[model samples]
Target: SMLDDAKARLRKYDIGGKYSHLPYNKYSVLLPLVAKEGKLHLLFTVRSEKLRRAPGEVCFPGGKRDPTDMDDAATALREAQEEVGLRPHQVEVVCCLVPCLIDTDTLITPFVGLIDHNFQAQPNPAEVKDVFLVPLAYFLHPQVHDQINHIFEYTNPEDGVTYQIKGMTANLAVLVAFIILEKKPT
Candidate 1:
């Protein structure tokens, strides 16, 4: 398949890698990308306030790995459809770019994919608050985004939420943006 392109370039960290010493819950998230008028953008979801654990925090579309999931990639695509309205068929999933381990007991694998620019999400209220987009180039220029220590901050104009976008959520987006654009962080 033509999907060999990204796979050829990226060898994502695997399960039972360096972080194999402790018990960590596994998850997979999709870094949904869209190119509108040649400008790249990323999709993020705000978790529902009703839920426990990082409620109202912004992250990519995904959730805990289901027992039925064939793999982390399948879990990512399945969760995308469940949290947002993005169907598996809608995404051109290139590959699993990388994985991140949280300080707590959690590990998340992020899959990079391209989707239609015009698609609006029917976010599940139980799982997601709403959806928003940030230009991929926004991460390439660190000067444009606010920072507190290692945490990244962005106030979404769509909902006026000033989220402390840190951790792998911020890290993966920056990595994906730089890699996809073929640019170095400036």
Candidate 2:
């Protein structure tokens, strides 16, 4: 029932090719949703400490694009499958959000999708150390997040192309709060 509704909402509009000019490396993350105990939950993963980049950080299942990947969505699905043993048939993609540029000179495309609750996680030790779930209802409460402002910019210190950038920056709690609100009755 929920998956059907999500597919309908995602198909209602067209949001394609919003970021085709980025020269940075492209990546994708899947915001996987599952129904548990009659409610929806989002899956999150902890990066392995053995990794060189962003070790021990919490994130969704995703990774950088490969030359064989057809698109960002393909990259996301492939990464998810590799990192968590999630199968392609287990997820139904809703839509992809606008790409965001991170400090690492990479462009990230976030895709929202519905996954079966029966799907099990088989995290790869080389990439993921742990996996967990957060209830959607927990974020529905208003006290979860706070607003924090900051700027993000990347620069090559040696090349002297450094320039301060201005953009939205919110506290982690506040960031997820806004996401929950925007996601709605999930």
Candidate 3:
């Protein structure tokens, strides 16, 4: 299955490193986000200022997978339910996308799903301060992306990889490499 292939590739990542051996939690979910026109429209939230992680940034609705969750579909559905009142029945599941690994050293599997054309969303007060969509074209465009640069404060002393995005530290190097390898979605 596509999801399994993604999972296997993620496992091959040296996540959590060897000494600590902190096994990363592999999770995948249908990101029922819509892309259209010359732009891709991904749903995101401005995390509450209180969030320990990216306090204000664009992101798909998802999270770490739980043992009880049978698959990425379930994980995605449940997270959407808790974060934005999205129900499983309401979303149309598309095929999966390449998995993304957060700085937390965990592998996040993403499935692109489509929501109703006119569906509205409600942001969870605890998880998100605001919910919005971003143009996919903007991210793909060199004009918008060129405006960004990267800076790193911490040092891994290993892997030696770094980059920036929208004035924040990000794994753009990996993204760029993937862009070269993986064709943009048709």
Candidate 4:
């Protein structure tokens, strides 16, 4: 019900147009939603220590677009499948948001999607260290969603380790919660 409304409103920000022309390293990230206990939750992955860039950082499943990928969603799905063993067919991509300029040479295209609430992650040891979910409503608060790149700490359900979420990933969560909840942060 809530997702349906957000899905309808997200149409205006669908990925395309000038974003396709950006001369930078384009990447696609999936913001997976899990509906459970009459609430919506978001999935996130912690990078493996073996990774070079942002090793052990919290992020959504994603990677750089491959040559064979048809479009933004394709890249996102492919990466999610590879990094978390989430089959492309299991994802119901709702919409793509505005691309973020992560840096002068990089742009990240984020897609919001729905996955089965019972879906369990089998993280690739080489890419992901841990997986966890957070309620979409948890981010509707004030201080938590008011800052840019603020770290939100949470313990992984699968593992006891605590992970910190920050940067564009955190910003995206705030934006998505604001959009879908239609609630203003006080």
- Pick the lDDT winner: 4
lDDT of 3 at 70: 73
2-33, model 1: which lDDT tens digit per residue? Answer: 13433343334222234323456988888887
Q: Estimate the TM-score for candidate 1.
A: 0.77
Using alpha carbons, what is the TM-score of model 2?
Answer: 0.72
Regions of model 1 farther than 4 Å from truth? 1-24, 103-105, 143-148, 155-163, 183-186
- Scanning candidate 1 in windows of ten residues, the lowest lDDT window is 13-22
| Candidate models: Cα lDDT each | 0.73, 0.67, 0.53, 0.82
Which residue pairs does candidate 3 place in steric collision? Answer: 40-136
Query: Could you estimate the TM-score for every candidate?
Result: 0.77, 0.72, 0.59, 0.86
lDDT of 1 at 132: 85
- lDDT tens digits by residue: candidate 2, 1-186: 755655565554325566844688887888787888776666777789999977776677888888998888898899999999999999988777556677878787777778976799999998998777665545434222223744332233346443222222112223333444455553
| Candidate 2 weakest ten by summed lDDT | 164-173
**Candidate 1 lDDT score at position 155:** 71
lDDT (10s digit) by residue, model 4, range 1-186 = 666776776666676555766678989999998887777889999899999999988899999998999887899999999999998678898887888886589988889998965578998998999888888877776334235445676654656766677788888998888777784343
Query: Residues 94-182, candidate 3, lDDT per residue (tens digit)?
Result: 54545556678776665555566556788898987766554333344423333345332221234442222343112332332233224
Clashing pairs in 4: none
